[PDB]
Amino acid sequence: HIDLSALNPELVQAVQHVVIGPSSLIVHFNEVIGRGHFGCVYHGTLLKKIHCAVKSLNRITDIGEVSQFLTEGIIMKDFSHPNVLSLLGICLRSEGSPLVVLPYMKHGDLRNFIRNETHNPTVKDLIGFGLQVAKGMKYLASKKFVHRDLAARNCMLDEKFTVKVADFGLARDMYDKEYYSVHNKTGAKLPVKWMALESLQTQKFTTKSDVWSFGVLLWELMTRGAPPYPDVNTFDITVYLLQGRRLLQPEYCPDPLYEVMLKCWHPKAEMRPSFSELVSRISAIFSTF
Ligand SMILES: Oc1ccc(Cc2nnc3ncc(-c4ccc(F)cc4)nn23)cc1
Numbered sequence: 041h042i043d044l045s046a047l048n049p050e051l052v053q054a055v056q057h058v059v060i061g062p063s064s065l066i067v068h069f070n071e072v073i074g075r076g077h078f079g080c081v082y083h084g085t086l087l088k089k090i091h092c093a094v095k096s097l098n099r100i101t102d103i104g105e106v107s108q109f110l111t112e113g114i115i116m117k118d119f120s121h122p123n124v125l126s127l128l129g130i131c132l133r134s135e136g137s138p139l140v141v142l143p144y145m146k147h148g149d150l151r152n153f154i155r156n157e158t159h160n161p162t163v164k165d166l167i168g169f170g171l172q173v174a175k176g177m178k179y180l181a182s183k184k185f186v187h188r189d190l191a192a193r194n195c196m197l198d199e200k201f202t203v204k205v206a207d208f209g210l211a212r213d214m215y216d217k218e219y220y221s222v223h224n225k226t227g228a229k230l231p232v233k234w235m236a237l238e239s240l241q242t243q244k245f246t247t248k249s250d251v252w253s254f255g256v257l258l259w260e261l262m263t264r265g266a267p268p269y270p271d272v273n274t275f276d277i278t279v280y281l282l283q284g285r286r287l288l289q290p291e292y293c294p295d296p297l298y299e300v301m302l303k304c305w306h307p308k309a310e311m312r313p314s315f316s317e318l319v320s321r322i323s324a325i326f327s328t329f
Contacts, residue, residue: 041135046054046103047110054114059087060141061127067094067139073148076213078109079137091127095140095211106137109210116209119183123176125196125206140210140305147197148207148217153190155265163292164329166261167196169203171322176205177254179314181247188245190253191234192260193219219267221274233268238279238309248309254318255304262293296325 041277044052064086074081086092115126133141147153154161161169172194180187187208189292193216196208204271207215214220220229225243232240236252239245256268268287272280286305289298298322306312313321 041108042103042137044132047107049110051107051114054117055130055132058117058127058129058130062131062133063087065131065139065141067093074215077217078213079303080197081142082146084112086128086143091129091144093144094131095142095213097140100137100305109212110138113208113210113212116184116211117313119180119185119209121176121179123203123205124179125204125208125211127210130210131172132280134183142211143198143204144152145196145198145204145206147201149193150195150197150203151192151260151265154195154261156247161264163260163262166264167297167322167329169197170258170261171319171326172255173205173257174315174318174322176203178319180205180208181250183307184247185223185244186247186253187253189231189234189249190250190257191219191231194258195257196313225275232274232277233272235277236305236309237278237307240278240281246309247315248312251285251315251318254315255301256287258297258301258304259290259293260288262297282307292310294325297322300325301304 065089068083071083072080073083073093078100079098082090082094082096084094097109100109118273120126126143128141128143131141139159154166162190177190189207196204196206198204207213214229219231220231221232222229224230224232224240234253234256237250239249270276286302303313
């Protein structure tokens with residue numbers, strides 16, 4: 041039961057650029073297609089009927105938290121790129137927290153897609169998906185947007201098998217609680233096994249730390265969704281990385297692609313490739329297939 045007048049008017053104006061009237065939106069609350077800490081995601085239809093994904097924020101009840109979440113995420117409306125998840129709009133209403141309306145992703149998240157045994161994506165398919173992610177991240181980096189939670193679970197696949205970098209902006213949540221731990225300097229639930237060494241040490245995130253995460257995502261792709269560092273406790277991830285240890289080469293990962301992964305995990309952030317370079321390198325590797 042959130043009230044508009046309470047929010048900063050500058051934020052209200054920004055939100056009203058993308059507002060969706062309740063009469064234009066039908067939500068199927070019995071059809072859950074995602075689960076987050078802030079609320080579930082439901083099959084919806086946006087009116088001419090469009091199939092969409094409706095992210096609930098009903099678990100966020102405080103106006104100060106709603107304001108902070110909207111403030112941090114609204115920039116999503118200014119992004120436009122085929123490999124970046126877009127915002128369809130925000131449904132405000134007299135009862136309940138704002139609903140975030142997102143495009144429906146027919147093939148769900150990339151991790152479950154590649155783990156599905158009937159799919160059996162080839163090495164070529166998987167490098168192609170990785171290339172798509174790199175292009176989306178190249179775009180976000182060019183907007184100086186730091187993702188902070190890039191991972192295979194957080195990329196979606198639409199009906200044409202276009203990969204959308206996701207779980208950012210107004211879509212931000214923890215959609216698989218298993219892979220977030222408070223065993224870190226911030227005390228907050230963080231994806232510690234996707235995080236760059238310097239982020240674990242200094243609590244700071246940059247595009248270069250997104251690059252580290254992208255390296256882990258490539259490793260997830262080549263292993264068809266195996267969990268990283270299964271034998272490393274969340275207590276030990278920092279010292280593991282300090283010792284110079286890294287994820288091992290996956291059986292079906294091409295040597296040059298593993299070289300790419302290792303570059304992404306260089307201890308010196310400035311030594312790691314840009315997403316622009318990653319697109320060029322992965323494109324070349326992809327093309328040999
Ligand atoms: O068809 C859709 C379904 C959910 C959304 C929300 C969203 N935004 N960013 C996201 N990152 C990840 C997931 C997600 C992860 C694991 C899972 F089992 C399920 C989902 N979801 N999501 C968007 C469209």
